[PDB]
Every structure is written in C-alpha cells, then in structure tokens.
Symmetry: D2
C-alpha cells in the first residue's frame, strides 16, 4: 500500500532505532515506478519513490511540461499500483530550489492540505526544500514556514544544508569544500526547527556527496561530518553524547562504496537517494536489446522489421526487471531488506 503518514513515521522510527535506511528511488514514468515498487517487494522491504523537478516535467509530457501536472499524474498512477503490493511505499519530491517553490512544492502542499481538510491523507508523504544555494538563515526561514504547512498536511519536510556536487538536470555544482556541512549549520537547524516537536523533518546534511557515478573511489565522502552533527545537536538539546537527534538523508547514493554506506548508517542516515545507478540498470538491457535485434528494430534492406522486438514492451520489461534488481541491491546495502512493516514475509 501507499504509506499513510502514520506508517511513514513508524518506518523512519524503526530504521533509526535499528541503524538501517530506505532507498529513495528517482522515477520518471509508469515503467520506472513499477520497477522500483517490484524491487521493494522482491526485497521484502518498504521504500520511497521520488520525483525530481525534471522527472515531474518529463512525466507531464512534451506538450505540457508542467511539474505539478507530472508529479500529480505519476502520484495517482503510483497510488493504484502500490495498493496491490504488500510493502509500504512512500511518495516524495526531490530537490526544489527557491525559484521553483511556487510552481512545485507549494502547489503540491496545497493539494494535500485540501485532501486533509476533507478527512483524507496527503497525496505525497514528504517534500524536499533544497535551499542550499541561499544563505543558511534564509534557507531556514523558508524551511520554518514550509515545515508548518507540511506538518498541517501530515507531510514530512526534507531540507538540505551544504551543497551536493555534480550535475542535476542542466545545472552543475562545483565539487569543492562547500560539499561539507559546517557545525554552525547543524546548530542553526536545531535552533530554527527543533528536533521534531515543531514538525517532523529529514536533514540532507552533505558530507562530500556528489550526484552521478564517477570511477569508484573518486568521490571522497566524510561520514564523520554526520557523527559530529549528531554530537553538536545532542549538546544543544542536553541529551547524552551518543544521542542522534537528526534523521539524515544520504544524497548522491549511486556509485558509493559499500563501506561508506555502512559507516553513514551508524550515524543516523534513514534515507539514501539513488537515481544514476537505477538509470544505468534500466537502460542497460534496452541497449543490449537494440544491438542484438538490430535487424528487427530497424527496417533494413527493404524489409519491414520485426514487431515482436520493436514492440516497446519487449525491451521495457527487460528494463523494468533490471532496475528492480538494482533496487533489491539498494535494500540489501541499506539493511532494510526483509524488514517491511507489513510483515507479510
């Protein structure tokens, strides 16, 4: 089923308590949603499906190119599908910067507020505010009012401090020192938003994260930044030094070393975003299909091709199954496999 807000909060609490995390898989289509949910199910795991601004625009089609339309359409599709799987599936929106709030997160929030006002549940269970490109104080000012709106709609807010390196859509962030979150940013976050009691939130605190897949080991993660952020917050809050007040989000998950994932889990990461690796998994058998069936997918030497192999289902089923396998791998990497809160086992 789709995660209710209550089940989603239980999911994250269980993950936190037991030092595991859920994959948050970027999807762009019916096929990619289907692949993600089947991956969760095959792994006996709960999970999160997320739409980026570009993914939502793509989902709306070339004749529309509207983020709200694409996200709503894909969300409605997902609600129907997820009802037929035993595992819990949460819907999320990825990086939304300041100039897209009015055309993505805010109208989506308003849609969910309306549903809640009628006694229903929100369409999405979490939304990301990415204010990493503006100064920390402005980031958190926007975060505070968005958190009030989100909590009122039974929605968890994800926020970001520090910058994720690499290319996300047309835009590149330089890989530098800004990829490492400062102690003061950790402190200001707690001051501004508390530790859950003013609305539940997730913190994408960056520790060297880079979107994309580079040669293994080229991206230099420093998970210790997270351990120190937890210590900083526990001190502010008057908690024991081993308390973990933050629920962390691991961006740029694809291409990470297994040891880096394992370490991050020890410091309170409850969500790891995966996009690039599942994109490769989806595309890889499509490529193979076109090459091995080149004379069926192309009308060559006066022949008319072979429908059996140019039927989009023929290669897209292969794409789906391959992406699902990669999602199973993510569930085993993050230790959420076999832990679905439905215990359908």
């Amino acid at each position: 089923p789709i995660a209710t807000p209550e089940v989603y909060a239980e999911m994250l609490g269980q993950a936190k308590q037991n030092s595991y995390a859920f994959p948050a898989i970027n999807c762009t289509s019916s096929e990619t949603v289907n692949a993600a949910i089947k991956g969760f199910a095959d792994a006996g795991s709960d999970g999160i499906i997320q739409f980026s601004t570009g993914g939502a625009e793509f989902g709306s089609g070339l004749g529309v190119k509207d983020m709200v339309t694409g996200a709503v359409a894909l969300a409605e599709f997902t609600h129907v599908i997820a009802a037929k799987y035993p595992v819990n599936v949460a819907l999320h929106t990825d990086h939304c910067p300041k100039d897209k709030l009015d055309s993505y997160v805010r109208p989506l929030l308003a849609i969910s507020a309306q549903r809640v006002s009628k006694g229903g549940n929100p369409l999405f269970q979490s939304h990301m505010w990415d204010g990493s490109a503006v100064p920390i104080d402005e980031n958190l000012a926007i975060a505070q009012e968005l958190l009030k709106a989100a909590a009122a709609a039974k929605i968890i807010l994800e926020i970001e401090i520090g910058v994720v390196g690499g290319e996300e859509d047309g835009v590149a962030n330089e890989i530098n020192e800004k990829l490492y979150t400062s102690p003061e940013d950790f402190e200001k976050t707690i001051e501004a938003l508390g530790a859950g009691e003013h609305g539940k939130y997730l913190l994408a605190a960056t520790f060297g994260n880079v979107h994309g897949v580079y040669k293994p080991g080229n991206v230099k993660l420093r998970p210790d930044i997270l351990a120190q952020g937890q210590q900083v917050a526990a001190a502010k809050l008057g908690l024991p030094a081993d308390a973990k007040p933050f629920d962390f989000v691991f961006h740029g998950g694809s291409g990470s070393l297994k040891s880096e994932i394992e370490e991050a889990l020890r410091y309170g990461v409850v969500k790891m975003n995966v996009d690039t690796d599942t994109q490769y998994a989806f595309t890889r058998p499509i490529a193979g299909h076109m090459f091995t069936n080149y004379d069926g997918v192309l009308k060559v030497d006066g022949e008319v091709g072979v429908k059996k192999v140019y039927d989009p289902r023929s290669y897209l089923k292969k794409a789906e199954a391959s992406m699902s396998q990669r999602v199973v791998q993510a569930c085993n990497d993050l230790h959420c496999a076999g832990k679905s809160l439905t215990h359908h086992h």
Copy 2:
C-alpha cells in the same frame, strides 16, 4: 480534457456526418499516453487512447500482472494529463475475448457504474467486446447484455464480427476467408442490438484486416464489404439505400494503403485502430540513440558510461516526439486533423 460521454457521442456524430474518423492509439505507459495526446494536440484533433489486455497487464508491472489494475492506473494517469490539453481524449479498452470478460471488461464496467451512481462520469468512455472467436449468436447474446450494462454506465460498446488476421499478443489468427464479414452477420447484428436505440455501439466488421505491418500491399482489404453491410442494414431498417446505420471500426490500421483508408472512410468508418506503426515510431529513435551513443549507454573499456545519455529521459523524449509525429500522420490520414470539437484552433 477527457471526453465526457456526451462529447464522445458528439465526436462520433461529427465524424460520421462528415466522413472522417479518429485514430485509436494503443498505449502501454505514461510515455506512450503522453505521445498520443501530444499527437492529437499537434494535429488540432480529438482522439482515442486504448489499452489492450496485454497493454494493461504490462501497465500493472511485472509484480502485479493484473489487467484491471493496469488499465485503472493508466486511466487515472491519463485523466490528469488530458485535463491540460485543449483537445478531447476518449479512453477505450481493446480486444477482450470471452475468457477475459470477468477479469477485464466486466470489472471495469462495474467501476464506472459505481462512479455514475454517485453522479460522476465513467472512467472509460468505451470498451471492446471481441466475440469473433465464438459463433455469431453467442457473440451477440453476450453483446446484448454488455450493451445494457455499458449504456447504463454512459459507455459505448465496441463489438466485432469476423476475425482480424495476425498476431495479437501470444495468439495468431490465420489469414483466410473468415477475415471477411458475412451479410447474415450484419443482419443479425441489427436484429439483436438495433441501430443505437438500445444503447450506442461501434461495429468492428472485418474486411480483410490484419494486425501488424507486412510489406505494403500484401494485406488485401475489401472495403466494399462495409458498403454492402450498410446497404443490408438500411434495407432491414426501411431506410434509403444510401443510409449508413453502422459506425464502423477499422482494425489493423498500421501499414494500410492511403487509398484503402480513403475508401473505408466513405462507408462509415469512424474509428481506426493504430498500434504497430506507433510502436515502430516510438522504438526507432531509441534504437538510433543506443547505436550513436554506444560508448555512453555501455560501460566500456573500464569507463563508467555517460549519464547524460543513459538517463532514460534522453531517449524516451525522442521516442515520445517520434510517436507523436506518427499520430499526427494518422489524424491527417483520417481527416480529423484541425477538427477538434473544442475549436481551440
């Protein structure tokens, strides 16, 4: 917008009166739905999006494989998208034989009946009963009760007399004399169902039709069968000899000669089904993408590929645009281009 039942009836009436038809494009996904609707819009045309049994199964994902789930999920997706286009889009289900009625058309009918009972409109605007594999009397007995249910849910029923040749999913129909509908079958149809006054229906009367794309000219259509069927019916009904009591459906549209389409339009074809040609149009740029970007979509010689080209959106946008072009061609072949009943022009 999605066609209301009243707008759909107006569409078909206009097409009939003016000797044009709408394309009915088989879709299987968010991308193919988006491509079809954009094609209609680019052509300034209304149109029909249809899901086959296999298309619906595919739409539900490999972990579900349920026709009702896939059709409902894709339908809900389509309702969101179609609201953002000026043209009218009707939703339809394709070939449903006797052994799949209880797991496809009937439960879908029941869903729409429920919506109508609450003062709403049906989820789908038409459904196909394909009883061509059973004797004509059984075919029409089932048709009569389905027509009552359909009319009660504000849904048009499509039925089939005669067999369409070729392969549709795993199953092949032999290309023979059964592809040509008999006069008695035309007569029994009118006796059983009337001419609209017991429920609105479309008639897929076969005249040599074959699913798929063979070398141009290999498939031998006999559109005169349709002209004679109209004459047969007008005689039964006591109408002038030039009356056209049937609304005909042209199956196996892909690969047809332009002259064959033109002739069929003169005898009351109001709907032509297209699947194979739009499948080729969708796949063709995907094939080209994989070949020209072979070293980006594959991790070769120890390199890690190129995300920009293995991102599924990169080739699927090309697929969408190419399929939309083929749909524009169908609208111009069927003379519905520039005739949308929204007159947004």
Copy 3:
C-alpha cells in the same frame, strides 16, 4: 590463373563476339581480392580485379601511402592466389588522371616493360588513363604515347572520353551534360589510335554514368550514345553500319538497372566496373556481426570480451562470402557466368 596477355585478349574477343562483359571489381586488400576471385570461380567466370589510386594508397598502409607500392604488393599477392583457381583473373588499375601518371601508371608500366624485356609477362594486364578532365586533344595525345608503351609491355590501355559523375575519393564531379560523350570525341578517338592496329585499347565512353549508389532510377543512363559511337566509328573505318569497332567500358556499374546493363551489352560493352555495391556487400555482415556480438566485441561492465568474435577472421570471413555473392550476381548480370575460357566447368 592470372590472365596472360594472350588469354586476356581472347577473353575480350569472346565477350565482344557473344555480347557479354566481365565485371571489373575494385579491391583494396587481401580479403577483397580473395572475395572477388572466389566470386568469379563460383560463377564459373573469368574476371578483372582493379585497384584505384586510393585503393593502392590504402593497400600500401598508413606508414607508406605510396600508390606504386600498394598496387605492386596487392598484385604480387593476387598472382599467388589466382594460380590456385581454375578461372582467368586479369589485373587492372582504375582512374589515373594527368597529375598522377608519373606516380602510378608510368612507373607501373616501366616495371612491366622490365619483366617483358627478360622474357616474362607484365605484372598488370591493363591500365587506365583517365584524361576526361583535360581537353579531348590533350587526352588523346597522352593516350597515344601511353598506348605505344602499353602495347610494348603487352598491356591493354583503357582511356576515358566524357566525365563520370559523382565522388571518387575526395573529389566530386558534377552530374551534368558532360556525362554524355560527343560524336566528335568518338571520331577523334578513332583518328588518333585507330581500331586496335596501333595497340589494343578499351574505351570508357560515358553515357550518363555516375560513381556510387543512388535511389534506383535516379541516375539516367543513355546507352544509345554507345550505339551511335559504334556507328560513327564504323563510318570512319568504312565498315558495315552494324560493326562495333569499340570495346566499351561501363563505369559506375553499381546501382544500375538490370535493363540498362542488358541494353549496354548490345552495343559492345565488354567490361563493367563495380565498386560501391561490392563495398556494401563486404561491410553489411561486418555491421551485423558487431551489433549481434556487441558484448563480445566490446569489453563491457568489467568483462574482457569474447575472442571468438573479436578475432578479425570471424567477421571478415562473413564479409568475404557476402562480397563473393555480389560478384556472382555481377557475372550473371553481365552474362559471363559459366563462360570461363579455362572450361573447367
């Protein structure tokens, strides 16, 4: 065996007498030579293997790029191979313009003169002088002295009047009226060189010929130009009006209509050049090989490929066999199949 000058003259005499012609296949390598000779043998036919200036440069390798070296190396290779086939194989050099005479045809002539002086036979059995880019009088002045040298070395000279359209190497000739040979050019040729008694020669008189392969029918051949050239010459020589004093060469053979070849044969064509079509035949199975074995010819996803399919012999044997089939087709198109003067049958 390699055609001796006496056997080559007999070949051409037989072809002329019986209204058939030999294919002259452009080759560039051991594999293409092997493919051509096997094609001749499979067709029970004699034939001609020819090297263009660019083909000879290619044959010499990227470290040498010397036309004489490449032609000699490929010729020596061919002498060894041809000895093992029952059919007669003549060696020829293709288009040599004025600025390449001193670095191609002349030094090759000198090599053969040396062999003949020692009591041997020439290395090549014919050479082409292409003076179509200079005025007719200069063309024939050069032709006359080259003919003396060639005859002294037991070599037949091919000359060209009129221009062949299209691209031959880096250089394009415009497709225009210059592609059609003038009566005066026919007359000047006979005046300058006679009709065999001052040295045996072949005449590439152009009649709309274009190098390359365009859509069937786009190239407009006028074989009547040849019939009139024969009439013009028979008049000058005081022969009956149905005499055929010229041995014609049909350039741009690839992509020609079968009816065009048949007509040209009636007017004394004894040699038709084929390059573009045999290039496509050679390459086509190589393309197929790479696509169907994509994961064997490329080291993908950390694997090391599959030697069985990246071994150049695996696809080059397929290339050879396919090119040989196209050469068999040329022998059947030109009616030389089953007519080898060895009568090994």
Copy 4:
C-alpha cells in the same frame, strides 16, 4: 626492409645481450601486416610478423583454404611493404603440430631451400615446430631433422617444450600442470640440438602461458622456470652459473602483467608472441564505427546508406591505426622500442 638471416641473427643477439625482446605479431591480412609494420616503425623498433596455420588458411581465401598458399601470398605482400620501412621485419610461422608439418612447415622449408640454392635468401626467416603434444623424445627427434633443413635454408627453428594453455583455433588445451616445463625437458633439448652449433634455434619453454586474454591476474605465470632452465643448461655445458644458453619465446603474451614481462626478460626471453590483444585493438574501432554510423552502414527505412562510411577503407584505416598503437605498446613493454638495428632514428 625484410630481415636477412644475418640481420635476424644480429637482432636476436642484440636483444639477448641487452635483456630485451621483439614482439611477434600474428597477422592474417594485408591490413594486419600493414598495422604491425607501422607499429614497429612508429616505435623505432625491429619486429617479427607471424602467420598461424589458421591465419595462413584465412589468408588463402575461402575458395582455396591452403596454408602454404596463404603464407606465401602474405609473405610476398610483406616483402614489398617492408622494403619501404627503415626497420627490420622478420617473417615467421606459428604453431605447427605433427599432422600439419607435411602441409605447412616442410613445403615452406622446401621453397626457401630452392631460393637459397639459386643464391637468394629464404622467404621466411624462422618457422615454428610445435611438438608439445607428442612425447619429448619424438618432439626432439623431429626437431633435430627440421633443424638441419632449416639451418641449410638459412632459417631459425622455433621449438616448444611444455604445453600452452587455452584455445588456438578450434582446439583447446587444458590449463594444468603440463603448462610448466620440466628440468629433464630442458636437459634433453641441449643434448639433442646443442646450444646453437648445430643450427640456430629458439625455445618456447612454457611457464604457465595461456593463449588469449582472461581477467588480469587469472593466468599464473612462473618465470622462475626459465631461470632454472638456463641454470640447468649452463651446468650441462660447463658454463658459469649465470650463463643463458637458451633464447626463450614467451607465448600467450596478450593480457600478461607488465611485471611478468619484465621478469621474463631477465631470464633470456628474446621473442614475445602477441595475437589476442592486437585482435582486440584492430576490431575495437570497427565496432565503434558500425555503431556510430549505423544508418550509413545499413540501408534503413528505404534509404540507400552512405558510401563514405560503408567503404571498407573508412573503418579499416581506423583498425590499422589502433592495432599499430598496440604494437607500439608491445615494443615499449619489451624494451625494443628505439633500438632498431638500422639506426635510422
């Protein structure tokens, strides 16, 4: 130039004295010969071109399939080409087992004996007798008489003790303990043939060698076997313990670790055979060419392709250049680069 027997002996003496070796590159064609020689030249190095039984059969063409014909044809081609390069190129034949002696090495020896009898030099400068599949005593009995014939024709004999693992043509040798040469085999070799004074020879003593390319490190070489073989022989001959009486040949060179090559050079390897790696280098840009030019090398959607890219020279020039680069790498790996005995520098 082609290496005279005197220059070839000088080459090997220089390599031995200075602890370097020459690559022996398997070739199958004009293009592969050209690529190999250009590689030697680019590296300022002498080198060896070798034809296997299968390579020679391939070189003779599908209509002939005769090892002697193919080897002679390719050798004659090579003599013309090599004259135009400043470096010395030696011609060799690879693995010839007992059942192919009468149809490969023996007739080739007879051809060279004839040339020498007329005051000329041999066609090939070395030939390989591979008797590893028969007992050591039979191997060396055949070796002794072949050595007499070879020396009389100014030809060096290569022999093999121990088995090379892997697939060489249709035949596979199991990767086991037989891949490691025994001390007694080293001793019997010296007893039978001496140390050069009864005819010059090269010794392919196996030390774990495997034909082909497996994942780096999977093939376990033991170069110490060679050091001990040298010690064994120096003892038999009454030489100092650091003497190197054997000239060793390193089979299965492709895919070897650089450290393994470096070690082998210290123990008297003067020749390393490379085939599989140069095959991959030749094929790799051909694959890339077909993919990136897929719509030019195939006639698609009713188009006629693009001659510029289906011309075999277009991709074979790329193949040549890539194989030459790999040969340059071999010259730098074996430390013969910059050491050509022509000192053209």
